[PDB]
Amino acid sequence: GLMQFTLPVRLCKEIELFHFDIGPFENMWPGIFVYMVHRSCGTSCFELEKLCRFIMSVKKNYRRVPYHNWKHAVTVAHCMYAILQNNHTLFTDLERKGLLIACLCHDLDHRGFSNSYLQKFDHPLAALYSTSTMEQHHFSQTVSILQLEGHNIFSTLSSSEYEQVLEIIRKAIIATDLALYFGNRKQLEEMYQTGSLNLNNQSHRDRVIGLMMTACDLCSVTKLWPVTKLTANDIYAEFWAEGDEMKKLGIQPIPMMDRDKKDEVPQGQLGFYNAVAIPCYTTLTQILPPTEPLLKACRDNLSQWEKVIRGEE
Ligand SMILES: COc1ccc(CN(Cc2nc3ccccc3c(=O)[nH]2)C(=O)Nc2ccccc2)cc1
Ligand SMILES: [Mg+2]
Numbered sequence: 001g002l003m004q005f006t007l008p009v010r011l012c013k014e015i016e017l018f019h020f021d022i023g024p025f026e027n028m029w030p031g032i033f034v035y036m037v038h039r040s041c042g043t044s045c046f047e048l049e050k051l052c053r054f055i056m057s058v059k060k061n062y063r064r065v066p067y068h069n070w071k072h073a074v075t076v077a078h079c080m081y082a083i084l085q086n087n088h089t090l091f092t093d094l095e096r097k098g099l100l101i102a103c104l105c106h107d108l109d110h111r112g113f114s115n116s117y118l119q120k121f122d123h124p125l126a127a128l129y130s131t132s133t134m135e136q137h138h139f140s141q142t143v144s145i146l147q148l149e150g151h152n153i154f155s156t157l158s159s160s161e162y163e164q165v166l167e168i169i170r171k172a173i174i175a176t177d178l179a180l181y182f183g184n185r186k187q188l189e190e191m192y193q194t195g196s197l198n199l200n201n202q203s204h205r206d207r208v209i210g211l212m213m214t215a216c217d218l219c220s221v222t223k224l225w226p227v228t229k230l231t232a233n234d235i236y237a238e239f240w241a242e243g244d245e246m247k248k249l250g251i252q253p254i255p256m257m258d259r260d261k262k263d264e265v266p267q268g269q270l271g272f273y274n275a276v277a278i279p280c281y282t283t284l285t286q287i288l289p290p291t292e293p294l295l296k297a298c299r300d301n302l303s304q305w306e307k308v309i310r311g312e313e
């Protein structure tokens with residue numbers, strides 16, 4: 001109970017900032033996550049023995065893929081930590097518990113392929129889950145890990161609190177399906193602009209948590225330029241392998257996934273920033289003003305991609 005996690009001074013300071021990079025030392029990531037739970041939730045939120053065993057089983061069920069890996073899980077949990085810490089009083093005790101765990105688990109057992117590739121391959125998961133294929137699988141994997149003996153970090157919640165938190169995690173993980181993001185953000189945009197947005201309305205909270213999950217999930221575009229640029233190489237490493245696999249099914253992949261169209265990456269990044277990233281962090285900043293640093297960093301990275309096109313790098 002009196003056992004705190006502590007970080008070295010530079011990490012202790014920088015971990016509070018939206019643009020923190022968790023570093024290349026894999027063995028420090030579990031402790032970083034526990035540090036974040038203890039500060040965001042409390043030292044009492046979870047039995048440390050059960051949390052440590054949950055974390056290590058989650059780690060084991062992430063695969064050795066270039067992007068959708070254990071580092072992505074902890075990175076997305078850190079962005080959620082920064083949001084929750086800059087919006088102290090807006091979230092219930094159950095939501096702070098649920099969302100950090102949701103972020104750590106949101107890409108469990110990812111194979112480095114999109115929902116589209118699974119459907120075109122006719123993968124068994126595509127028959128089990130017709131929409132949000134991987135995301136329903138990620139939630140399924142999360143529930144399976146929670147039910148391993150000694151892994152139930154929610155054991156001290158009442159029956160209804162346990163049902164509520166699993167509901168927060170399910171919706172949070174499903175919201176990471178980017179196909180759902182576009183409609184969710186437009187609805188939140190209308191609601192904010194007409195003034196109907198009401199954080200005591202559960203369906204409204206659900207929408208706001210959804211956008212928060214998208215924002216944490218995309219947080220690669222909100223880091224310092226050298227982290228953004230080097231993370232993009234990992235994302236394209238997965239996309240181009242998927243494109244290769246599309247070519248093996250006799251389907252020309254979209255340019256985004258075709259390694260022969262590397263040259264078009266800078267202009268493709270502009271599209272992404274303008275169509276997905278900037279809108280996401282703009283609506284988030286309207287609803288949760290203290291998340292403005294994410295929007296600012298995102299605009300800084302758009303400007304860096306514009307400089308890449310203009311041959312200035
Ligand atoms: C943060 O890192 C990343 C890394 C990769 C991506 C993939 N990506 C950008 C992209 N790269 C290309 C490369 C070559 C050729 C064509 C393209 C292209 O049209 N798009 C994307 O989603 N496009 C998009 C465009 C408009 C709307 C939605 C999506 C996104 C983010
Ligand atoms: Mg995902």
Ligand SMILES: [Zn+2]
Pocket residue numbers: 072076106107176217
């Ligand atoms: Zn993700």
